[PDB]
Design a protein around this ligand. Structure first.
Ligand code: CUZ
Ligand code: CUA
Ligand code: CUA
Ligand SMILES: [Ca+2]
Ligand SMILES: [Ca+2]
Ligand SMILES: [Cl-]
Ligand SMILES: [Cl-]
Ligand SMILES: [Cl-]
Ligand SMILES: [K+]
Ligand code: NA
Ligand code: NA
Ligand SMILES: [Zn+2]
Ligand SMILES: [Zn+2]
Lengths: 586, 573
């Protein structure tokens, strides 16, 4: 299996890395592991203007006031258990958001702040019949309402919730109150069941408390029952949110219609569906095991045909110290990160299941040393029924001496491992910034991108509507619209010239500049920077982009095209002239 | 001799050079390993960095000063400080064209530690360092002509008080040293190997020129008090314009075709080489003739030109292997051309000599290029990076935006060989390499480090010993939390405030194990920062929402990382 991609060759896979607490999504080529693109999501990007432009701030809504994010879990939309390459979704733990990225333009196109929760951590997508719902965990228990009268986590109204977002509209679909808390989550291959690990069944706030219980659990959700309850109008609502809220807590030992709690040790972390649809696999973390939940047994569990929730567990292989996450090669083998032992352990799920029945057999096939302290791992197409068993990436949190010293802050080490054969082979050390937690790979032919924008694209449709109110045709017009103390400049751009090369405003005017790049050649991006005003944005071919700033400085102020576009790039400039306040009224 | 160097750095092996890439329009600096071309670290400078809190923390906003209000930057030209014409590994400097700044990075901690807004100019673009006897001055070009004063009374760019200026910053204090008014507009700049001379291309005389500065004469004028000041800046300003055809004393204007661009000093110190851009040539200025030029011993400013090789369409920039060759990017022809400087000089006198050695195709439209140690008299002729603006089909498609293609070229032998295509984001533009042994970094912070000294001072006023204390100080509607942190526990795990209070959280990571970084995020408050071992970091926000609000450690630091959390309780008003 070729490891190196030479000049003029292309990678075989796309890789979508989370940006960690840096807040972006990174697009890598695999197996070269080179970064092809950064997709700003929760960060402010000086280069494209994301978080400065009117289009981006409209997508972010009120959360445009935050300059930070913390993302962990990127996932690609599916149809019938296979990637369809339309959307990628990712969480924000820092400000409790979920974002959707459109894979054809590789931009964030929708974002939602999840109501009545703190900290979106785990996220995964419905697999079958297609990604109708995005499932997201809120990690921290809070009071409801959270108005500062009650702070106690033990109050009957202190809880966290499992969240379902409608993937196509990016509005809330429902929320399910749970006992304990939520960590990671996955979904079955039927659409009926989802599952999440919980580490704080104690509802404590201190370290000792959260480790008190021998087992926490994985909570299993019957989504068909939740939908049935929503259609029956049997739910409540919290605060000013109209999201249906259903109660999945145990009420004095009686289970909810919506949930069942399977005891699992101990502060379990990863929650992964095997690619054959047979198991939810929960990594035991503080327990040196994984727990294997038989998805075929869940209907019987929800029908009261099982005496004990543990009856749905059909294996608990002892793997090593600090199991965190599991992935699958599609040949019947599972691969699990051991954080403390600092290894990846390859094991055979069916032999694990036989050993739980007492049939002594060695289900452990190989342990590979990794460098050092691995968190997530991901095998190519592992989240689909097309898991192809070629590449594995283990994302390690301490790189120590694996790279040149760069000061007190070290890179993460994302290691590429060949699993096409019976023996795992470590082939590449990839340093990365800001702690990617997880990543997802797709075949080159599962992703189709646009090279030029459509003029009706929803990304800037609000800007086109604003232009219409001004009677502007964005494809041709170079006009300055004046409206009181507001000024709206509309121009075309066509390397190496701005369509409006000079305009005059009053000191204090609120200036919006809207640029439509009317080039036809792919790859001729234009930029727009206003010197010393904190204004920067990119405009690609056939895109309309706009940005608003206050002209608070009298005098002459240059603007220039930031993106190299032509041999005469450094001459694509213009002048804003600001008449002083003392020459105008007030 | 062949070009054979190994290009692959396998698991467990280390790169041989550091690469310092400009972050382009994204505004950071990037640290790469060469020859792997992998990104080891991101250093935030003009961008806001959610991961480390740069632009959010009190320490970073203090360094940024008033310019902390800007969320953007546009950088191009990174350069490492020198002693005796060799890298000394102390500082990296870089420009901000978007908001007219120069920043200094300390290479021992890989953080930006000083920043200056250059007064009375618009857009810092070209930038280079004094080489000899060391980097006393940072030289920076302001690109755009503006009125003086720029108060809205005059907009005419041909008014007698409309001009731009060459800028000298004191490298060690990061205060302005002096500015020199010039004719025309400035593009790129370089310095000689003595400290007396510097030079800059000008593209908008409206043949343009390379303006040469006699820095000794400028310094003499400043020491004698013969200068003016502009506006509310105390920076000495000297007039380097031609007045009625009379030369300044501080400057000479050397005619050079055409809209010249790059301005590069050869590593043997002999030449300033200006790339022709619209002219298919480079022009070679003999630095050893400059004293005679400023002494009025030469008939014509063209007499310092000793070579004008014809290279190809669209020469932009030049670098050096230290063996006597120059390497120039041809933007139009989309090539790197290798040529021999001494043979070009002899051709200029009329000898039939072929100075061109090889043309290598690159992909596509190269701008800057950089050979290893080329800015020093130690130029080693091993590696060459050409930074190409249009990558086209060289990488997988990723939508309407495309990556720059930074291509690594083996120049160790007699033939250039292309060995790697490196995609990069937001047009890094230029880069600089240093030997592994030229860079020495700290493993853990020193407690006396200037980076957070202002925070140690605040703590002093509160009577706080940052190394041990876990305390909440109340002062009106201000709340100052001080805590130590030690994975996996925050030293203060809960505190209570009033809605509306202005909260400052100061965290001191007292771990002594390298690489055990901590983070601090306050949920739904837009607060995020990093605290590495022995660092103190601080951040201020207002508690504007009543109720219970969790905070957590963002940096995976421990098996119990998920459980390293705290509670802020906000009492309603
Ligand atoms: Cu957020 S957790 Cu194991 Cu996913 Cu990294
Ligand atoms: Cu438009 Cu460069
Ligand atoms: Cu402290 Cu993770
Ligand atoms: Ca527990
Ligand atoms: Ca000109
Ligand atoms: Cl998981
Ligand atoms: Cl240059
Ligand atoms: Cl040679
Ligand atoms: K790390
Ligand atoms: Na939204
Ligand atoms: Na400063
Ligand atoms: Zn440049
Ligand atoms: Zn250039």
């Amino acid at each position: 299996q070729k490891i190196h991609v030479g000049p003029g060759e292309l990678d075989d896979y796309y890789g979508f890395w989370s940006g960690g607490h840096q807040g972006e999504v990174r697009v890598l080529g695999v197996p070269s592991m080179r970064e092809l693109m950064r997709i700003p999501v929760f960060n402010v990007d000086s280069a494209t203007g994301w978080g400065l432009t009117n289009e981006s701030r409209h997508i972010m809504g009120d959360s445009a006031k935050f300059l930070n994010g913390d993302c962990h879990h990127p996932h690609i939309s599916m149809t019938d258990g296979k990637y369809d390459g339309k959307y990628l979704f990712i969480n924000d733990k820092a400000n409790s958001r979920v974002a959707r990225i459109r894979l054809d333009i590789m931009k964030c196109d929708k974002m939602i702040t999840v109501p009545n929760v703190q900290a979106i951590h785990g996220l995964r997508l419905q697999k079958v019949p297609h990604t109708k719902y995005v499932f997201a965990n809120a990690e921290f228990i809070i009071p409801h309402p959270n108005d500062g009268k009650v702070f106690d986590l033990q109050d009957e109204n202190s809880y966290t919730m499992y969240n379902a977002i409608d993937a196509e509209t990016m509005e809330m679909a429902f929320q399910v109150i749970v006992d304990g808390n939520l960590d990671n989550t996955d979904a079955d291959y039927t659409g009926r069941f989802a599952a999440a690990t919980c580490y704080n069944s104690e509802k404590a706030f201190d370290l000792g408390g959260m480790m008190r219980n021998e087992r926490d659990w994985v909570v299993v959700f019957d989504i068909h029952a939740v939908e049935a309850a929503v259609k029956a109008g049997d739910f409540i609502t919290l605060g000013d949110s109209k999201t249906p809220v259903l109660d999945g807590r145990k009420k004095d030992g009686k289970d909810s219609k919506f949930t069942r709690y399977v005891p699992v040790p101990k502060n379990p972390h990863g929650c992964n569906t095997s690619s054959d649809g047979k198991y939810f696999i929960a990594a035991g973390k503080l327990s040196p095991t994984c727990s294997m939940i038989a998805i075929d047994k869940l209907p019987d569990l929800f029908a009261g045909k099982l005496a004990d929730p543990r009856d749905v567990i059909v294996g608990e292989p002892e793997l090593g110290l600090g199991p965190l996450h599991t992935t699958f090669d599609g040949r019947g083998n599972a691969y699990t990160t051991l954080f403390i032992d600092s290894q990846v352990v390859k094991w055979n799920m069916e032999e694990a299941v036989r050993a739980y029945k007492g049939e002594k057999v060695n289900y452990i096939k190989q342990k590979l040393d990794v460098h050092y302290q691995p968190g997530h791992l991901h095998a190519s197409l592992c989240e689909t029924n097309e898991a192809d068993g070629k590449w594995l990436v283990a994302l390690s949190k301490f790189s120590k001496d694996r790279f040149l010293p760069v000061g007190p802050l070290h890179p993460e080490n994302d290691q590429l491992i060949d699993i096409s054969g019976d023996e795992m082979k470590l082939v590449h050390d990839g340093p990365t910034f800001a702690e990617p937690h997880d990543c997802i790979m797709a075949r080159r032919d599962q992703i189709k991108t646009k090279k030029i924008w459509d003029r009706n694209d929803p990304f800037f449709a609000p800007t086109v509507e604003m232009a219409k109110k001004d009677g502007i045709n964005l494809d041709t017009d170079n006009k300055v619209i004046r409206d009181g103390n507001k000024v709206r400049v509309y121009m075309t751009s066509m390397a190496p010239a701005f369509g409006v090369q000079e305009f005059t405003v009053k000191q204090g005017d609120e200036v919006t500049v809207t640029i439509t790049n009317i080039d036809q050649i792919e790859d001729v991006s234009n930029g727009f920077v206003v010197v010393n005003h904190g204004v920067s944005m990119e405009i690609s071919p056939q895109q309309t982009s706009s940005i608003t700033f206050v002209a608070d400085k009298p005098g002459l102020h240059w603007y220039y095209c930031s993106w190299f576009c032509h041999a005469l790039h450094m001459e694509m400039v213009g002048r804003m002239m600001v008449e002083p306040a003392w020459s105008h009224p007030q």
